[PDB]
C-alpha cells in the first residue's frame, strides 16, 4: 500500500521484503534465503570479511562476462544461492558451478561500443519477455537494444555516448552518467512496442 512509509519507519523489514521480492521474481523459494542466513549467522564478524573477500575474488576471476562484472543487486541474490548450495552440502566447487550455471541461462549481459570491459548492464531474461513464451525474451531484447541506440543519437552530449542498463523491481532503466537522461521500460511497454512493430510489419507485407 505504501512502500516509502514502511521504509522510513521499519527499514529492516523493508529490506527483507525487497530481498524476498527479488527472489520471488527469480522464482526462488524462501528456503534459500533461510539457508544463507543460517550459514551467515553462525559466523563471526572477522570470518564474514574473509568470506566476502573470497566470494568477490572467485567472482572476479571468472571467465563469463555475466559473472565477472555482475551488478551489486544481482550479486546479493547470487551470493544467497551460492551460500545455500554451500550450506546444504560441503562442496564450494559445486556451489560455484551451480550459481554460475543458474546465472548464465537466466540473465543476459548488454554490451556497448568501445567500452573498457565491454559490459554496460545485466538484465534477467524473464523481464524482457513480450509474450508468455520464454523464447520471446529475444524480441524484448531487440526493442531494448534499438532503444539505447536511439537515445544516444538523440542526446549526443552524454559523457562517452554510453548508457547503463539497470533492472529494478519490474522496470528497466536506461541512464547516463549525470542522470539527466533516464528512460524507463517495463513488460507492458515492451509488449505494446512489439505489438505496434508487428502490426506495421504485417501491414507492410500485406500491402506490398
Amino acid at each position: 500500500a505504501d512502500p516509502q512509509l514502511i521504509a522510513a519507519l521499519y527499514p529492516d523489514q523493508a529490506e527483507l521484503f525487497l530481498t524476498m521480492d527479488m527472489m520471488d521474481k527469480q522464482g526462488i523459494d524462501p528456503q534459500v534465503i533461510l539457508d544463507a542466513d543460517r550459514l551467515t549467522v553462525k559466523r563471526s564478524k572477522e570470518q564474514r570479511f574473509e568470506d566476502d573477500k573470497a566470494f568477490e575474488s572467485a567472482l572476479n576471476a571468472s571467465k563469463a562476462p555475466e559473472i565477472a562484472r555482475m551488478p551489486a543487486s544481482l550479486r546479493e541474490s547470487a551470493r544467497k544461492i551460492y551460500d545455500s548450495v554451500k550450506y546444504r552440502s560441503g562442496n564450494e566447487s559445486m556451489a560455484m558451478e551451480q550459481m554460475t550455471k543458474f546465472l548464465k541461462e537466466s540473465t543476459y549481459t548488454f554490451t556497448g561500443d568501445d567500452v573498457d570491459g565491454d559490459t554496460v548492464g545485466v538484465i534477467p531474461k524473464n523481464m524482457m519477455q513480450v509474450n508468455s513464451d520464454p523464447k520471446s525474451w529475444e524480441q524484448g531484447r531487440d526493442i531494448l537494444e534499438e532503444a539505447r541506440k536511439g537515445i544516444i543519437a538523440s542526446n549526443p552530449w552524454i559523457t562517452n555516448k554510453q548508457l547503463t542498463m539497470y533492472s529494478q523491481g519490474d522496470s528497466i532503466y536506461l541512464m547516463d552518467t549525470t542522470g539527466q537522461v533516464r528512460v524507463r521500460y517495463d513488460k507492458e511497454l515492451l509488449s505494446k512496442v512489439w505489438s505496434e512493430n508487428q502490426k506495421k510489419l504485417e501491414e507492410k507485407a500485406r500491402e506490398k
Binding site: 549526443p156 552530449w157 559523457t159 549525470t178 539527466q180
Partner: protein, 228 residues
C-alpha cells in the same frame, strides 16, 4: 431552561406541525413532550442516552413496530420517523381514553401493564395518591398545555391547605443551580513556519550546455579545432 420557552424562536420545529396534522395530536402537547424528554438537546446523554428528540428506550422502540434494528444500533435516530411514531402513539392514547383526555394519555410516561394499569385506574377514580411520584410530576409539568377534565383537580392536590394548590418541583426548585466552570474554548497551537530563501534550480551539465548553445559536442569541437 425556564418556563419551557414557549415563544422562543422555534428551533428545528419544521416537523411537529406535519406530524400533528397527520395524527391529530395537539401541536403544543407534542412540542412540550419533546422538550420535556430531550430539551431539544442534540446529545441527550443519560443511562441509555438516546440523542433523538423522543428519548425512548430499546423495549419501547421495538414495541412501537418500527425497524429499529438498523443503522447505528438503533433506527430511531433520524428525527422525522421517531417523531411521527411518537405522535401516532400519542394520538392512539388520546383517542382510546374516551375523548380529548390529554393527561390520562400520559400513560405514555408509565405504559400499560403491571406498573401502569393501577395508576390509570386510580386516575380514573381521581385518586392521585396511588399514582407514582414520577407520573404525578410528569403530568404536573404538562398542566400549562393540556386539555383535561381533571386538570383542575391535579393542581389542587398537595396544597398546604385544602384551598391551596400543589407546587410542582419545576417551580419550587426553580432557580437553584450552579454554573459549569469548564467551557469548550480550546487552547490553540501554532506551527513553526519559517519560509526561507528558495533553492536555486539545478544547472545544466557543462557538456549539455555546450551542445545546446553550439550545435556540436565538446569532442567534435576539440577534434575540429585541433586539426589545424
Amino acid at each position: 431552561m425556564d418556563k419551557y420557552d414557549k415563544n422562543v424562536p422555534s428551533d428545528y420545529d419544521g416537523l411537529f406541525q406535519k406530524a400533528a396534522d397527520a395524527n391529530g395530536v395537539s401541536y403544543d402537547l407534542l412540542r412540550k413532550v419533546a422538550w420535556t424528554e430531550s430539551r431539544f438537546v442534540p446529545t441527550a446523554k443519560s443511562k441509555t442516552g438516546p440523542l433523538g428528540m423522543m428519548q425512548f428506550t430499546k423495549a419501547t422502540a421495538k414495541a412501537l413496530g418500527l425497524r429499529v434494528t438498523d443503522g447505528p444500533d438503533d433506527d430511531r435516530l433520524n428525527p422525522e420517523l421517531a417523531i411521527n411514531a411518537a405522535a401516532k402513539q400519542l394520538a392512539g392514547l388520546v383517542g382510546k381514553f374516551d375523548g380529548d383526555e390529554l393527561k390520562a394519555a400520559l400513560a405514555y410516561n408509565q405504559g400499560e401493564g403491571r406498573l401502569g394499569n393501577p395508576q390509570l385506574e386510580a386516575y380514573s377514580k381521581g385518586d392521585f395518591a396511588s399514582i407514582s411520584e414520577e407520573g404525578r410530576n410528569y403530568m404536573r409539568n404538562l398542566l400549562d398545555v393540556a386539555k383535561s377534565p381533571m386538570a383542575g383537580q391535579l393542581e389542587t392536590f398537595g396544597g398546604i391547605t385544602p384551598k391551596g394548590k400543589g407546587i410542582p418541583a419545576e417551580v419550587g426548585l426553580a432557580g437553584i443551580g450552579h454554573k459549569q466552570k469548564v467551557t469548550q474554548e480550546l487552547p490553540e497551537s501554532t506551527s513553526f513556519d519559517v519560509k526561507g530563501i528558495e533553492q536555486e534550480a539545478t544547472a545544466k551539465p557543462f557538456a549539455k550546455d555546450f551542445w545546446e548553445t553550439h550545435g556540436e559536442t565538446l569532442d567534435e569541437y576539440n577534434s575540429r579545432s585541433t586539426f589545424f
